[PDB]
Amino acid sequence: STVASSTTEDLKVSTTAGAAAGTYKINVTQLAAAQSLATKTTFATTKEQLGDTSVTSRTIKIEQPGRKEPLEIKLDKGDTSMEAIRDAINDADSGIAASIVKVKENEFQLVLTANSGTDNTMKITVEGDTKLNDLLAYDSTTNTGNMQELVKAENAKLNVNGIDIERQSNTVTDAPQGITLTLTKKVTDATVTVTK
Amino acid sequence: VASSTTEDLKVSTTAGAAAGTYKINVTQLAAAQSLATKTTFATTKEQLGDTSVTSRTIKIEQPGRKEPLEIKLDKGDTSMEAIRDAINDADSGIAASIVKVKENEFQLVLTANSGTDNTMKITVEGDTKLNDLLAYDSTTNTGNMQELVKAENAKLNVNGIDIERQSNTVTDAPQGITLTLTKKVTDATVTVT
Amino acid sequence: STVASSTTEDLKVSTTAGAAAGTYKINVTQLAAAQSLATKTTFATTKEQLGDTSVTSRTIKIEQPGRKEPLEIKLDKGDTSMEAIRDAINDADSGIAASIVKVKENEFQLVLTANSGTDNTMKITVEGDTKLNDLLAYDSTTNTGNMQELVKAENAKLNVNGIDIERQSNTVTDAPQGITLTLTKKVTDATVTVTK
Amino acid sequence: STVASSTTEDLKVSTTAGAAAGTYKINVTQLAAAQSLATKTTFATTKEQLGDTSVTSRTIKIEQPGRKEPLEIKLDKGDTSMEAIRDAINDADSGIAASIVKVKENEFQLVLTANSGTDNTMKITVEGDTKLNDLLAYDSTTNTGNMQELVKAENAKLNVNGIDIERQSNTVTDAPQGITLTLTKKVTDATVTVT
Amino acid sequence: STVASSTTEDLKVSTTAGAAAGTYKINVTQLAAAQSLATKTTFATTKEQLGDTSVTSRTIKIEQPGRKEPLEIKLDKGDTSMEAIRDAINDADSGIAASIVKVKENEFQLVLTANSGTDNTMKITVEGDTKLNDLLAYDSTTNTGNMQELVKAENAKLNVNGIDIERQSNTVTDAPQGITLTLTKKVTDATVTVTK
């Protein structure tokens, strides 16, 4: 039976039964962050058509370094509204979140956000609709595109007893094995104590 | 289900909202224009208006109000109590309260809902003495009433997008989430799951 | 209904249901204070008679600006001890509190303390006992007398959205109607918020 | 049928039923403090005899302004170790607390603590054993001696509705009668209220 | 009975019944720290064999100033993977913790950490397997070896009412007898108050 304690609430600690007793001096120097992309232009309503209403079907293809197989979201009904795109991406339930932000009256913006970490930076292309492609396309390799990066993807970086660690998410395991650290903010010289 | 890193920023959700984590900075809380009479009065029952006229109307105009609010003071009574009760009985997004600065010094205060859409232009039709007391024009910040609080909008950043609202109850940032602002906060995180 | 909050725990708020929503910028420049009077000398015990044992009844008369009927406390049983004077005053239960302070062994001191505010400053005379009058008499009108003012009465002075407010007590109501503020400390640019 | 409340957690208040309803403006300008003395030298063990083992009897005499009769702690040949002196003092259970400080491995030091207040400052002498006197002798009246003062004795000083009060302890009664104040920190313009 | 409070939560206190009532002015100028050693090379997996696969037995010998007799951990059972070494060291349960840090994908590192204090600095030699010695050997006397020091051993240093105190750990006792202090951070002019 293992038990863990942290000197700060800004660093949650859990253990497994295999964990060893010990005391760890932890510094968290950076938090993992998810890339977020937003359309450069805004739109008067969430129902107006962001792509070409002449075409029945197009595919939003999303590529990511950690994703083995490209994500292909098909809009095969002719509806290319901001709501239609949002609901198609999200219904795929595949590590990408489409959201709509109203900046103020008559000004709606589409936001696509990945999971955390540099492995999840996005390359978006649209096949079969040059109107929607000119809105949604982004290339994280050349960090150029039609959408804008409002939040850059970043990794969690921390130091455990002098060893520098990097992770895709702020749920840090294997630092050391036996312990799960949840990072909620940058901290200096916190101490996690494990006891049996 | 949804949650927040600070008790100063509340969050609710709806049934079909997406998951995610949102980095939020709140740079300004929405605030409501509040106006007070420049002069104070001995009692809340003494007649503040012209008692030779039976009827007059207080006319209130706001950029966000389609049809101007018309408060009839018909019963011949222009006491501070009557005017407060008249305004509040309309229950139309304007609150009247009385401030007792000290014994026998009473001041009338009118407060709107929050936001710049709710700045007030006040006129009284048919009673010049009451017009002299209550008149205000927010366009030029002129009149015999004084601005106690400046109407102000809520301003915030959600994952890099600057947002403005009339109220401290922010919806549609993004659609799904209802944020409640109580304090200016830096790098707060909301998480939907 | 209504709920209210403060940016500082040093300023407590309460509302009715009728309280208008709004924001209140608050400065507290002076706390209300209660006049406190003490006998000029101390005494060896609390049970020794401080007044003329030759008269059966006498009357302590206390007048204050805010009090319409003068307060009259009769010491009926020929007992003028410090205990008797304290208990007779307190039992009257009329906004005047008597208390005994042992400054040190065989040095006891009688203190009369009113409710806070300048309206409650006290004019004390004793009818029918010159000895007790030579101990308890005080005239706040002229700040002369046989007792000594240990605490000067003062009113609460605060400012709410630019309007100067004055009260006899640190429980401020009617500024505006619907809100009740309890003042415990001088505060600078505190904000009180009331929402529906 | 009486209750009491404080405007600050720094000042704890209770009542007894003879207390009357009222408000009290209290300022605490100084806390009461207990005198504490340490030996100037440290020793390798708590078992080694610190006194002169040529003398059979010696007496640690402890005098305090508020103590009517001096505390006399008598020690024989085998009772002059640090343990022995500590145990003898504490076993007397007479308001002086003896404690051993281990400063590090093989470095031990003796501390004597009185109760709070300036009436409890100590004059320590040892009758009949000069070696143990060279260790334990102290005089508060001139603030000199062979021991060293770690903590200065100090009285509680407070102001209750404009009356300056001084007590030997931080548990303050009879100011006013019917109220007990426990002082934990210096505080300005606090109000206690009874109903 | 006795209770104890602290002016700071960075300094935690407990007291026995007999502890002396009073105040203890406490300055903590150094926290105790435990020597933590790490392998200089990282490995692709925690399953791959680190030792000489031609030898059937080796012993990890660990010596420390405060340990009268050397700790000998035998690796005897056809496995010298990082996990197998970690489990062997931790199964000894003799005040040395082995842990595995994944610095990032396919980079695992073995860490050995002693109890805190200069008495627990480590001399590590492997007997009978030079390939494992080449990985685990360290000499604290000469501050060299095949492992690297990531955290230097250190003693607690603090001052209590003007008496400098030193300890091997951040649980401090006998300063004075009857009071236990837990040091979590350097503190300046903290007061602990013991009340009966």
Short mmCIF file of C-alpha atoms in Angstrom, two decimals, chain D residues 33-34 36 38 86 97 99-105 109 111 113-114 148 150-151, chain E residues 18 20-24 160-167 173-177 193:
data_model
loop_
_atom_site.label_atom_id
_atom_site.label_comp_id
_atom_site.label_asym_id
_atom_site.label_seq_id
_atom_site.Cartn_x
_atom_site.Cartn_y
_atom_site.Cartn_z
CA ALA D 33 6.42 35.90 27.18
CA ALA D 34 8.24 33.33 29.33
CA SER D 36 14.14 30.87 28.85
CA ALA D 38 20.36 27.96 28.16
CA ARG D 86 16.34 17.87 34.07
CA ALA D 97 10.40 23.28 32.87
CA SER D 99 14.46 20.42 28.64
CA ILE D 100 17.45 19.00 26.78
CA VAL D 101 18.32 20.31 23.32
CA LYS D 102 20.30 18.02 21.09
CA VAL D 103 22.14 20.49 18.85
CA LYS D 104 23.65 17.70 16.77
CA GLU D 105 25.26 14.31 17.36
CA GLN D 109 22.55 21.63 25.93
CA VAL D 111 17.30 24.75 28.70
CA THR D 113 11.86 27.65 30.85
CA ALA D 114 9.70 29.58 33.41
CA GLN D 148 22.37 32.86 28.45
CA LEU D 150 17.18 32.70 24.91
CA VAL D 151 13.79 34.37 25.41
CA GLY E 18 5.49 17.13 28.56
CA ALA E 20 7.79 23.10 27.56
CA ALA E 21 5.22 25.84 27.03
CA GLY E 22 6.66 28.90 25.29
CA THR E 23 7.63 30.49 22.01
CA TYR E 24 10.25 29.19 19.65
CA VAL E 160 15.63 27.73 17.46
CA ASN E 161 15.61 30.73 19.83
CA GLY E 162 19.21 31.38 18.80
CA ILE E 163 20.58 27.84 19.05
CA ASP E 164 21.87 26.47 15.74
CA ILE E 165 20.67 22.90 15.17
CA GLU E 166 21.61 20.31 12.56
CA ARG E 167 19.97 17.07 11.49
CA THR E 173 13.20 16.24 17.11
CA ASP E 174 14.92 16.86 20.43
CA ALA E 175 15.28 20.59 19.62
CA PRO E 176 13.93 20.75 22.26
CA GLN E 177 12.81 17.32 23.48
CA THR E 193 3.96 28.64 20.29
#
